[PDB]
Amino acid sequence: YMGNPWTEYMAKYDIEEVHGSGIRVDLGEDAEVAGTQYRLPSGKCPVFGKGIIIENSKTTFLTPVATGNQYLKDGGFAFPPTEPLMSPMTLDDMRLLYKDNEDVKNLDELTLCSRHAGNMIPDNDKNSNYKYPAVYDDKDKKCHILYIAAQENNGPRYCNKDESKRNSMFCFRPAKDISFQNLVYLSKNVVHNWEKVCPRKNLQNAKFGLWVDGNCEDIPHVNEFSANDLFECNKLVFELSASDQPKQYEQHLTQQAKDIGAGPVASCFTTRMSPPQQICLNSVVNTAYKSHGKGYNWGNYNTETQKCEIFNVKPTCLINDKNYIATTALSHPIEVEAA
């Protein structure tokens, strides 16, 4: 074939190319709102099974952000109610909302959710390119626009883990956790044909390799870790994967906040898509480094020896092996299909 026969199938595993941003923490672009610059998610692939854990809270992150006189920790990350309604929104209501937008009405549910989230422009800057990320719940078929685009915050200086301090900034981190298995984390850039060009399911009886001299050889170096099941391996790969989070702390609070993706304060919005329309929150919100996709994004899970083999070089072929399942940080942590 005068070339690597695996090329078409393996294109979706070139995560620098097809995703192009962090996975664990995605903050791969910057956008301005009225002369202030903010970090925001920019990955082109959906991230299956990713949610945000809020430390020492029973409140889940898809809960609306605290508004009005609510305490910060009694809320989550999601858009609060708006007039007219925007989030959360069922797939069916999204299609109705955009029925007269030709280029949007028939998008697949994930791309539609992303475009829906990206419709609102903070009303302080009509020309802003700031677009909020979203989470789609595949079980409920419901799109949640995220008001908070930050994905990790830690350090006693920058958050407070104490449950009795209700209005102090909470600590949080991204995770693949069974409670998030039906969630899909979506940046503003998710491509319309993700079904074809991005990973989703784990590959049964296959392990990643490199195409060398007309044969598929093992990845030259892998890091082998104990992992009891495939889900645990997917979690380990996710934790090691491309990340746009700062590795250190900035002394100044406002600089650290910017660096972790603190965003604009908006109470009203306009729309990118016709018809032009004002959208306002029901209640105002509580007042209280780029990987470009490079990292340890891939794993070969040995189901016999219970070893997660994690590596940071893009794979270019598959090896048939009934003891292996091939995973990526983008992949769903449970779903599998045959190679």
Which string of DSSP letters, residue by residue, matches 256-281?
A: HHHHTT-----SEEEESSSSP-EEEE
Q: What is the resolution of this structure in A?
A: 1.5
Which among 331, 291, 333 is positioned nearest to 312, based on CA atoms?
291
Q: Which residues contact 25 (CB under 8 A, 6 or more apart)?
A: 151, 152, 174, 243, 244, 245
Q: What residue spans of the chain are helical by DSSP H?
A: 7-10, 15-18, 91-97, 109-117, 194-197, 230-240, 253-259
Helices (H), 11-105: 15-18, 91-97
Helix (H) or strand (E) holding 328: strand 317-328
Please give the C-alpha separations between residue 7 and each of 14, 190, 317, 326, in angstroms, as whole numbers.
10, 22, 8, 17
- Nearest alpha-carbon partner for 147 in 53, 82, 78: 78
- Inter-residue contact 256 to 158 (CB < 8 Å): yes
**If DSSP codes are grouped into helix, strand and coil, which group holds residue 74?**
helix
What is the layout of strands, in order, in the sheet containing 142-145? Answer: 47-48, 183-186, 134-137, 142-145, 89-90
- Which residue do the tokens 């990118």 mark? 272
Residue 240 has what DSSP assignment?
H
| Structural contact between residues 15 and 242, judged by C-beta atoms closer than 8 angstroms | yes
Name the residue type at position 318: L
CA–CA separation, 134 and 147 (whole Å): 9
Count the Cβ atoms, other than its own, within 10 Å of residue 12: 19
The C-alpha atoms of residue 96 and residue 79 are separated, in whole angstroms, by 20
Domains present along the chain, CATH in parentheses:
1-19+200-245+295-339 (3.50.4.10), 21-197+260-288 (no CATH)
Q: Is the peptide bond before 88 cis (omega within 30 degrees of 0)?
A: yes
What span, in angstroms and rounded, lies between the C-alpha atoms of 43 and 330?
A: 11
* Helix, strand, or coil (residue 11): helix
d(CA 313, CA 145): 33
Centre a 10 Å sphere on the Cβ of residue 164 and count the other Cβ atoms it contains: 7
Q: For residues 62 and 77, is the Cβ–Cβ distance under 8 A? A: yes
